[PDB]
Amino acid sequence: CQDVVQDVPNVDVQMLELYDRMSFKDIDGGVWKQGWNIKYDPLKYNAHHKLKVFVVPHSHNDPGWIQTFEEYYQHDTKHILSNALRHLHDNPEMKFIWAEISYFARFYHDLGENKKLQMKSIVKNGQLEFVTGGWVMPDEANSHWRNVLLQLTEGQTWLKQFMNVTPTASWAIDPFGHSPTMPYILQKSGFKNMLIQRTHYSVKKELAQQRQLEFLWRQIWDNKGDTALFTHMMPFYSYDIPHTCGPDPKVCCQFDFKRMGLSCPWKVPPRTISDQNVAARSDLLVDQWKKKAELYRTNVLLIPLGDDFRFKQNTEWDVQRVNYERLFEHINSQAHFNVQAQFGTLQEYFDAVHQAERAGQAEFPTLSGDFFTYADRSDNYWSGYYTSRPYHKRMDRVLMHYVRAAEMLSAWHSWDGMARIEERLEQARRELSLFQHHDGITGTAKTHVVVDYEQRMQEALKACQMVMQQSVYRLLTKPSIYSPDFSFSYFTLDDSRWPGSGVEDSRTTIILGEDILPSKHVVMHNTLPHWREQLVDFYVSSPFVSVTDLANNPVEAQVSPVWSWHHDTIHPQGSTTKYRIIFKARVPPMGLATYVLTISDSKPEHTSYASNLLLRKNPTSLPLGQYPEDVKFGDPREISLRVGNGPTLAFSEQGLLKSIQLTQDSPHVPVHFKFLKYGVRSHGDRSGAYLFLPNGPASPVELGQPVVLVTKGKLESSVSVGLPSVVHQTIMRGGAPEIRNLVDIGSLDNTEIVMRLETHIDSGDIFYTDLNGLQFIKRRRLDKLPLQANYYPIPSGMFIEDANTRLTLLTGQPLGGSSLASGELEIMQDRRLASDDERGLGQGVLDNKPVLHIYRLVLEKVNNCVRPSELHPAGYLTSAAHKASQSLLDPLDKFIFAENEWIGAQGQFGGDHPSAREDLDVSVMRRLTKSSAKTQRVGYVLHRTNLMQCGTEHTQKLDVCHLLPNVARCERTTLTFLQNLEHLDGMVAPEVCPMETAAYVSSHS
Ligand SMILES: [Zn+2]
């Protein structure tokens, strides 16, 4: 296994290094506004050195943007694919690429067997070529790598099953910036090449000047270069026809034959090609092709031909095809050009380029880094969509977990198809996969489409719940008794974090009474492959509740009131009728643990009760029903809480973190939480769904006299405050604290609420942010770039550090963030925007809703951690910060038994499961076969992260091949499970390197 910490890789282009020595001057370049006047020596070409031109027709289909998936399908896509089928069949030289398998599967299943067989033949003879073959073309900023893999697997599994094809070339023309997470996943899913488009105009220029637009893209830690994937970056402003033929859109636009209610912004129409004009038109077009070709190293040239929802009408197919045939006919027949031009596919382009490389014509440069933050022109940076519609950004992370848990829980057995497990999981994977779309998780869709994404994720959440509860009941009910009704709710799920009480008071109360119902079974699930002890909580009808395991062993517990926040100013109210019972669940690896909540007359031996202090001016008292410890009152003051041997936090009199003492004999290190506002420019460019165009630095939010609630217990204490827009909360359980913001931006038009941390950590201009929750990349704040250019995606976490200290903020949701000054972290909470940012969405963001954002805050000493070289472009979390991220993304699942009595009940599942090293995760467990298959197969994805070593154990080799019994074989596979890469003679899974991801499939007899 490579070391990923001391060996800095040697690459031709390192984006962080490149960014430092880039001027980013926005020179007007000419006809190519963001580049220069391209010159070629025309004696470059002759009969032995021809230009080979691949014109590749395409149709960019959004699975939701201005219209819903189903709207666009009925209005546009089903016509595009009907016409593709007809026209390609009738025209053997005509070609077409297709990316979005969600739309293709919708179309294909509605065809007759004849059409279906017509479709297969035009895919078989390579006329219709699938590119990437993901369910969607996903967002690359906000998406978790798990969901990128999920949507890829969903698309390519469909393609294998129904087309017997597996694409090896990716097409990513529309995501708003590009992540190295894509080549990472693609290179481990069999891919050989990938195409990208949406990169900063200064980056297109810098690279075009060195002919570094095609590059071997490796990961930022990869010394050897086994992660390398061949990447073509398109050189111009857009993927449309005016921006794909060559450097002068005025010319290129005249070769968009559909534009003869569509016209050319540059006011020169396309003209029908004739014998009259063909020589003149071919000269114009080949001169464009030869200019574009100067930018690349081979004599092979990629010319995309398409745009959004193109190739819809039968006549658009004719007019594009026939005019380009005449051109090719003239051009290929005329030696003075030294061009061979034809319709081709993306794979044909890449094959030809590698034949040129193999034949010694070009050797390609190596690149590491990312392509964030994207700017299409001047100072219009696309950092807004890192935060837009943050409710659904949070919902993505919640549904991410429920799909993993539902797939894992149900994987342990084969189900009779009567149960409809397969159908639920398929619906759930697909709704999650569709939301990965670059107008889904981005929050760049119209209000009604966002509503559709939300209703789809809501259905999906409910399908997961039904699979999870049926699974738990089977796993923990004596087989001698197990006799399931597949349509019955044996458990309801309890989730204290989605949507969050405050977003919707809809957690069930467990009603106990010594006559009516004295005890209740609950079950915790732990999807992680190691032992976990995590405080869980339930709503209960009495405060006199005791916890036991099923062996009646007592478990220590704390009871807190249920608190709610209300508004004239903003104050808490206590329930007189329900309480929180809190206790430490201990759950096996990928396992279940049963506990029992029992009522008594009075304070039970093993249940403590939290105090409640309402730091408010001018008080009026609050009853809490039978809650034994009466709420205390007082005036605003500073407070200091500790829980367990964990940190001691100090707080202002507004209930905002002021400082953290780690250990008992260590200093009170300053750490100020603070809420600010960014607004919108009155003059010039307006912020929207996509763009972050702030009117100068953010300014403080007036807090007034905020009512500060303090709850203090043995197992959990918290400091909550009612701020304008935000109920801010610091929860303590004996380690890194948890931050919760109920964000209600309400009606504050043209406002972005940010949460900043101010420290004395000597970070300088350095901060780290994660990419797709997979890897942490080094950022340098660049004063030469405006504010919005120093904003980066925060899909999982950000951190600053100096010689001695590091502070890491982990997120439960993807959000925008920066370190705009030394020792600071900031992360945007929500944004409301009256104005459109003129990228075609035709609305602002005025559909905000309450969201509960969740964080963990890890202050740490790193002076005794082996930190990577100062030249290394990557950072790595500690164990503490990694486990803190796991507690946000994949917490324990809580189940409440629905019925009075549970005959069969067992207290544990997975006690015998191996407890793998802290840096290893079973990302995916998924059964691949239905019951009516003689060999059961189960797929596992293993990710091993890399944790900073600071010297601290005792675990046990996990081998996923033996997890289920009667293993007849297992294979190392592609991450989609679709290809075998290594027959494993042992039927043992070999161990996995730091930052590596590997898939295995185990077969059972
Ligand atoms: Zn798009």
mmCIF file of N, CA and C in Angstrom, residues 380-466:
data_model
loop_
_atom_site.group_PDB
_atom_site.id
_atom_site.type_symbol
_atom_site.label_atom_id
_atom_site.label_comp_id
_atom_site.label_asym_id
_atom_site.label_seq_id
_atom_site.Cartn_x
_atom_site.Cartn_y
_atom_site.Cartn_z
ATOM 1 N N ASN A 380 -18.459 36.111 -11.909
ATOM 2 C CA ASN A 380 -19.714 35.354 -11.684
ATOM 3 C C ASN A 380 -19.297 33.931 -11.298
ATOM 4 N N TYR A 381 -18.963 33.751 -10.018
ATOM 5 C CA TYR A 381 -18.534 32.475 -9.419
ATOM 6 C C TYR A 381 -19.787 31.728 -8.942
ATOM 7 N N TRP A 382 -19.828 30.407 -9.176
ATOM 8 C CA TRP A 382 -21.005 29.523 -8.954
ATOM 9 C C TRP A 382 -20.890 28.895 -7.563
ATOM 10 N N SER A 383 -20.633 29.711 -6.529
ATOM 11 C CA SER A 383 -20.592 29.245 -5.118
ATOM 12 C C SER A 383 -22.004 29.288 -4.473
ATOM 13 N N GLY A 384 -23.016 29.828 -5.145
ATOM 14 C CA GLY A 384 -24.369 29.935 -4.563
ATOM 15 C C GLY A 384 -25.029 28.569 -4.384
ATOM 16 N N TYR A 385 -24.815 27.661 -5.341
ATOM 17 C CA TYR A 385 -25.511 26.360 -5.410
ATOM 18 C C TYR A 385 -24.881 25.402 -4.403
ATOM 19 N N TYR A 386 -23.799 25.827 -3.752
ATOM 20 C CA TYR A 386 -23.212 25.065 -2.637
ATOM 21 C C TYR A 386 -24.154 25.155 -1.450
ATOM 22 N N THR A 387 -25.110 26.084 -1.479
ATOM 23 C CA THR A 387 -26.035 26.326 -0.336
ATOM 24 C C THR A 387 -27.506 26.355 -0.773
ATOM 25 N N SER A 388 -27.847 26.766 -1.990
ATOM 26 C CA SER A 388 -29.265 26.861 -2.479
ATOM 27 C C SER A 388 -30.081 25.635 -2.062
ATOM 28 N N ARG A 389 -31.304 25.865 -1.560
ATOM 29 C CA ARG A 389 -32.334 24.868 -1.153
ATOM 30 C C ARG A 389 -31.708 23.859 -0.195
ATOM 31 N N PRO A 390 -31.239 24.349 0.964
ATOM 32 C CA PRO A 390 -30.457 23.542 1.885
ATOM 33 C C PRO A 390 -31.280 22.483 2.613
ATOM 34 N N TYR A 391 -32.604 22.681 2.707
ATOM 35 C CA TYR A 391 -33.567 21.669 3.227
ATOM 36 C C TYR A 391 -33.378 20.323 2.501
ATOM 37 N N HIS A 392 -33.431 20.356 1.168
ATOM 38 C CA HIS A 392 -33.269 19.162 0.286
ATOM 39 C C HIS A 392 -31.810 18.677 0.282
ATOM 40 N N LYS A 393 -30.858 19.561 0.514
ATOM 41 C CA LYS A 393 -29.422 19.195 0.663
ATOM 42 C C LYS A 393 -29.255 18.316 1.896
ATOM 43 N N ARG A 394 -29.908 18.699 2.989
ATOM 44 C CA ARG A 394 -29.956 17.886 4.221
ATOM 45 C C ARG A 394 -30.691 16.564 3.947
ATOM 46 N N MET A 395 -31.778 16.618 3.182
ATOM 47 C CA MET A 395 -32.680 15.450 2.980
ATOM 48 C C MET A 395 -31.908 14.372 2.212
ATOM 49 N N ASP A 396 -31.009 14.801 1.321
ATOM 50 C CA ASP A 396 -30.125 13.921 0.527
ATOM 51 C C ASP A 396 -29.283 13.069 1.473
ATOM 52 N N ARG A 397 -28.647 13.697 2.455
ATOM 53 C CA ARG A 397 -27.792 12.984 3.439
ATOM 54 C C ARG A 397 -28.614 12.008 4.269
ATOM 55 N N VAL A 398 -29.823 12.391 4.679
ATOM 56 C CA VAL A 398 -30.722 11.514 5.473
ATOM 57 C C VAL A 398 -31.090 10.334 4.573
ATOM 58 N N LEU A 399 -31.572 10.593 3.366
ATOM 59 C CA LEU A 399 -32.019 9.467 2.509
ATOM 60 C C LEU A 399 -30.804 8.595 2.142
ATOM 61 N N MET A 400 -29.600 9.177 2.084
ATOM 62 C CA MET A 400 -28.357 8.427 1.766
ATOM 63 C C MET A 400 -28.235 7.291 2.768
ATOM 64 N N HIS A 401 -28.395 7.648 4.036
ATOM 65 C CA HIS A 401 -28.251 6.722 5.179
ATOM 66 C C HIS A 401 -29.330 5.629 5.141
ATOM 67 N N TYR A 402 -30.573 6.015 4.923
ATOM 68 C CA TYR A 402 -31.748 5.103 4.954
ATOM 69 C C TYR A 402 -31.624 4.086 3.805
ATOM 70 N N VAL A 403 -31.080 4.463 2.650
ATOM 71 C CA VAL A 403 -30.890 3.483 1.539
ATOM 72 C C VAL A 403 -29.806 2.483 1.984
ATOM 73 N N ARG A 404 -28.695 2.971 2.499
ATOM 74 C CA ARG A 404 -27.627 2.064 2.970
ATOM 75 C C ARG A 404 -28.203 1.110 4.020
ATOM 76 N N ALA A 405 -28.911 1.640 5.020
ATOM 77 C CA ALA A 405 -29.410 0.824 6.156
ATOM 78 C C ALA A 405 -30.436 -0.198 5.662
ATOM 79 N N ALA A 406 -31.378 0.229 4.828
ATOM 80 C CA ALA A 406 -32.466 -0.609 4.264
ATOM 81 C C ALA A 406 -31.891 -1.744 3.405
ATOM 82 N N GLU A 407 -30.928 -1.420 2.545
ATOM 83 C CA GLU A 407 -30.211 -2.403 1.692
ATOM 84 C C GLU A 407 -29.416 -3.368 2.584
ATOM 85 N N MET A 408 -28.665 -2.866 3.574
ATOM 86 C CA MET A 408 -27.845 -3.702 4.489
ATOM 87 C C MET A 408 -28.760 -4.631 5.304
ATOM 88 N N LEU A 409 -29.752 -4.084 6.003
ATOM 89 C CA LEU A 409 -30.631 -4.848 6.923
ATOM 90 C C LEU A 409 -31.293 -6.026 6.191
ATOM 91 N N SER A 410 -31.820 -5.786 4.980
ATOM 92 C CA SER A 410 -32.584 -6.735 4.132
ATOM 93 C C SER A 410 -31.651 -7.688 3.386
ATOM 94 N N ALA A 411 -30.359 -7.386 3.300
ATOM 95 C CA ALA A 411 -29.362 -8.188 2.553
ATOM 96 C C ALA A 411 -29.127 -9.517 3.277
ATOM 97 N N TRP A 412 -29.360 -9.555 4.589
ATOM 98 C CA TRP A 412 -28.981 -10.728 5.424
ATOM 99 C C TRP A 412 -29.766 -11.977 4.971
ATOM 100 N N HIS A 413 -30.983 -11.822 4.438
ATOM 101 C CA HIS A 413 -31.849 -12.926 3.925
ATOM 102 C C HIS A 413 -32.336 -12.668 2.500
ATOM 103 N N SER A 414 -32.764 -13.745 1.829
ATOM 104 C CA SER A 414 -33.621 -13.734 0.616
ATOM 105 C C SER A 414 -35.042 -13.469 1.082
ATOM 106 N N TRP A 415 -35.787 -12.652 0.362
ATOM 107 C CA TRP A 415 -37.212 -12.419 0.684
ATOM 108 C C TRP A 415 -38.090 -13.073 -0.381
ATOM 109 N N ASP A 416 -39.197 -13.656 0.028
ATOM 110 C CA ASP A 416 -40.267 -14.039 -0.920
ATOM 111 C C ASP A 416 -40.746 -12.749 -1.590
ATOM 112 N N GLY A 417 -40.859 -12.743 -2.917
ATOM 113 C CA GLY A 417 -41.286 -11.580 -3.714
ATOM 114 C C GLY A 417 -42.609 -10.993 -3.259
ATOM 115 N N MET A 418 -43.425 -11.753 -2.525
ATOM 116 C CA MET A 418 -44.679 -11.259 -1.879
ATOM 117 C C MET A 418 -44.381 -10.031 -1.005
ATOM 118 N N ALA A 419 -43.202 -9.995 -0.342
ATOM 119 C CA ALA A 419 -42.728 -8.911 0.571
ATOM 120 C C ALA A 419 -42.501 -7.581 -0.181
ATOM 121 N N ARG A 420 -42.195 -7.650 -1.491
ATOM 122 C CA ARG A 420 -41.904 -6.490 -2.384
ATOM 123 C C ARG A 420 -40.712 -5.703 -1.832
ATOM 124 N N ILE A 421 -39.653 -6.387 -1.387
ATOM 125 C CA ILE A 421 -38.402 -5.758 -0.877
ATOM 126 C C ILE A 421 -37.696 -5.117 -2.078
ATOM 127 N N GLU A 422 -37.449 -5.926 -3.115
ATOM 128 C CA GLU A 422 -36.771 -5.501 -4.365
ATOM 129 C C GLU A 422 -37.428 -4.228 -4.911
ATOM 130 N N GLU A 423 -38.750 -4.136 -4.950
ATOM 131 C CA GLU A 423 -39.463 -2.983 -5.565
ATOM 132 C C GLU A 423 -39.276 -1.694 -4.759
ATOM 133 N N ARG A 424 -39.324 -1.803 -3.449
ATOM 134 C CA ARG A 424 -39.072 -0.692 -2.504
ATOM 135 C C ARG A 424 -37.660 -0.161 -2.693
ATOM 136 N N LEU A 425 -36.664 -1.044 -2.612
ATOM 137 C CA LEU A 425 -35.231 -0.662 -2.711
ATOM 138 C C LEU A 425 -34.969 -0.029 -4.090
ATOM 139 N N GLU A 426 -35.602 -0.539 -5.138
ATOM 140 C CA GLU A 426 -35.436 -0.003 -6.511
ATOM 141 C C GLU A 426 -36.021 1.411 -6.563
ATOM 142 N N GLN A 427 -37.281 1.600 -6.170
ATOM 143 C CA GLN A 427 -37.840 2.966 -6.026
ATOM 144 C C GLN A 427 -36.884 3.854 -5.213
ATOM 145 N N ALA A 428 -36.413 3.399 -4.078
ATOM 146 C CA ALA A 428 -35.633 4.256 -3.156
ATOM 147 C C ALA A 428 -34.307 4.631 -3.826
ATOM 148 N N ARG A 429 -33.523 3.668 -4.303
ATOM 149 C CA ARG A 429 -32.267 3.968 -5.068
ATOM 150 C C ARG A 429 -32.528 4.986 -6.190
ATOM 151 N N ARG A 430 -33.634 4.885 -6.903
ATOM 152 C CA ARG A 430 -33.869 5.693 -8.121
ATOM 153 C C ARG A 430 -34.224 7.133 -7.758
ATOM 154 N N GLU A 431 -35.109 7.357 -6.790
ATOM 155 C CA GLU A 431 -35.439 8.721 -6.324
ATOM 156 C C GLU A 431 -34.139 9.369 -5.792
ATOM 157 N N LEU A 432 -33.343 8.657 -5.010
ATOM 158 C CA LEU A 432 -32.068 9.239 -4.479
ATOM 159 C C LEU A 432 -31.154 9.552 -5.673
ATOM 160 N N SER A 433 -31.030 8.605 -6.604
ATOM 161 C CA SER A 433 -30.163 8.712 -7.797
ATOM 162 C C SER A 433 -30.573 9.936 -8.622
ATOM 163 N N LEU A 434 -31.857 10.116 -8.864
ATOM 164 C CA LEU A 434 -32.399 11.257 -9.646
ATOM 165 C C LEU A 434 -32.037 12.597 -8.988
ATOM 166 N N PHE A 435 -32.090 12.666 -7.661
ATOM 167 C CA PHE A 435 -31.748 13.904 -6.903
ATOM 168 C C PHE A 435 -30.266 14.254 -7.048
ATOM 169 N N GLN A 436 -29.419 13.300 -7.459
ATOM 170 C CA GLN A 436 -27.988 13.560 -7.689
ATOM 171 C C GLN A 436 -27.831 14.458 -8.917
ATOM 172 N N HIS A 437 -28.839 14.543 -9.780
ATOM 173 C CA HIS A 437 -28.866 15.467 -10.955
ATOM 174 C C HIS A 437 -28.330 16.867 -10.566
ATOM 175 N N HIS A 438 -27.613 17.499 -11.479
ATOM 176 C CA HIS A 438 -26.975 18.838 -11.329
ATOM 177 C C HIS A 438 -28.017 19.967 -11.281
ATOM 178 N N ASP A 439 -29.328 19.677 -11.334
ATOM 179 C CA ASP A 439 -30.350 20.686 -10.940
ATOM 180 C C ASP A 439 -31.177 20.169 -9.760
ATOM 181 N N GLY A 440 -30.777 19.041 -9.157
ATOM 182 C CA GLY A 440 -31.441 18.433 -7.986
ATOM 183 C C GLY A 440 -30.825 18.930 -6.692
ATOM 184 N N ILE A 441 -29.812 18.225 -6.221
ATOM 185 C CA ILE A 441 -29.082 18.522 -4.957
ATOM 186 C C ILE A 441 -28.519 19.945 -4.993
ATOM 187 N N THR A 442 -28.203 20.450 -6.180
ATOM 188 C CA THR A 442 -27.723 21.842 -6.408
ATOM 189 C C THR A 442 -28.731 22.901 -5.926
ATOM 190 N N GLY A 443 -30.033 22.615 -5.939
ATOM 191 C CA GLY A 443 -31.070 23.608 -5.625
ATOM 192 C C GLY A 443 -31.179 24.668 -6.715
ATOM 193 N N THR A 444 -31.047 24.262 -7.988
ATOM 194 C CA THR A 444 -31.039 25.194 -9.139
ATOM 195 C C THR A 444 -32.256 24.916 -10.035
ATOM 196 N N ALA A 445 -33.248 24.189 -9.533
ATOM 197 C CA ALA A 445 -34.512 23.867 -10.244
ATOM 198 C C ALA A 445 -35.638 24.846 -9.822
ATOM 199 N N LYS A 446 -36.722 24.872 -10.592
ATOM 200 C CA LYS A 446 -37.897 25.737 -10.316
ATOM 201 C C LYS A 446 -38.648 25.126 -9.133
ATOM 202 N N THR A 447 -39.423 25.960 -8.441
ATOM 203 C CA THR A 447 -40.091 25.646 -7.158
ATOM 204 C C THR A 447 -40.834 24.315 -7.307
ATOM 205 N N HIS A 448 -41.620 24.174 -8.375
ATOM 206 C CA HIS A 448 -42.523 22.999 -8.550
ATOM 207 C C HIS A 448 -41.710 21.698 -8.724
ATOM 208 N N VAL A 449 -40.522 21.807 -9.322
ATOM 209 C CA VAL A 449 -39.616 20.654 -9.593
ATOM 210 C C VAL A 449 -38.942 20.239 -8.270
ATOM 211 N N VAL A 450 -38.453 21.226 -7.512
ATOM 212 C CA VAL A 450 -37.925 21.016 -6.132
ATOM 213 C C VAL A 450 -38.990 20.279 -5.326
ATOM 214 N N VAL A 451 -40.265 20.634 -5.521
ATOM 215 C CA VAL A 451 -41.381 19.985 -4.758
ATOM 216 C C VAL A 451 -41.441 18.519 -5.184
ATOM 217 N N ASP A 452 -41.359 18.261 -6.486
ATOM 218 C CA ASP A 452 -41.357 16.880 -7.049
ATOM 219 C C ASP A 452 -40.156 16.095 -6.466
ATOM 220 N N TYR A 453 -38.939 16.635 -6.513
ATOM 221 C CA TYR A 453 -37.763 15.936 -5.934
ATOM 222 C C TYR A 453 -38.098 15.552 -4.485
ATOM 223 N N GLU A 454 -38.669 16.501 -3.749
ATOM 224 C CA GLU A 454 -38.992 16.326 -2.309
ATOM 225 C C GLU A 454 -40.028 15.209 -2.134
ATOM 226 N N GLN A 455 -41.080 15.176 -2.954
ATOM 227 C CA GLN A 455 -42.160 14.153 -2.819
ATOM 228 C C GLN A 455 -41.593 12.780 -3.170
ATOM 229 N N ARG A 456 -40.674 12.743 -4.135
ATOM 230 C CA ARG A 456 -39.957 11.506 -4.521
ATOM 231 C C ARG A 456 -39.074 11.030 -3.349
ATOM 232 N N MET A 457 -38.330 11.920 -2.684
ATOM 233 C CA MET A 457 -37.415 11.516 -1.570
ATOM 234 C C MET A 457 -38.251 11.064 -0.360
ATOM 235 N N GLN A 458 -39.408 11.692 -0.163
ATOM 236 C CA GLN A 458 -40.409 11.343 0.887
ATOM 237 C C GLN A 458 -40.929 9.928 0.636
ATOM 238 N N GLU A 459 -41.311 9.596 -0.593
ATOM 239 C CA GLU A 459 -41.763 8.209 -0.916
ATOM 240 C C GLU A 459 -40.639 7.219 -0.595
ATOM 241 N N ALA A 460 -39.439 7.537 -1.076
ATOM 242 C CA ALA A 460 -38.217 6.731 -0.933
ATOM 243 C C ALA A 460 -37.916 6.503 0.533
ATOM 244 N N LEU A 461 -37.991 7.565 1.355
ATOM 245 C CA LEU A 461 -37.730 7.442 2.817
ATOM 246 C C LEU A 461 -38.688 6.397 3.392
ATOM 247 N N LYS A 462 -39.970 6.468 2.999
ATOM 248 C CA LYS A 462 -41.046 5.576 3.520
ATOM 249 C C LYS A 462 -40.814 4.153 3.010
ATOM 250 N N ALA A 463 -40.369 3.962 1.764
ATOM 251 C CA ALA A 463 -40.021 2.616 1.253
ATOM 252 C C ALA A 463 -38.866 2.031 2.085
ATOM 253 N N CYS A 464 -37.787 2.786 2.346
ATOM 254 C CA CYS A 464 -36.667 2.321 3.228
ATOM 255 C C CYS A 464 -37.185 1.871 4.613
ATOM 256 N N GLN A 465 -38.057 2.662 5.226
ATOM 257 C CA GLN A 465 -38.575 2.438 6.603
ATOM 258 C C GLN A 465 -39.259 1.072 6.653
ATOM 259 N N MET A 466 -40.083 0.803 5.647
ATOM 260 C CA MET A 466 -40.858 -0.457 5.550
ATOM 261 C C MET A 466 -39.899 -1.635 5.378
#
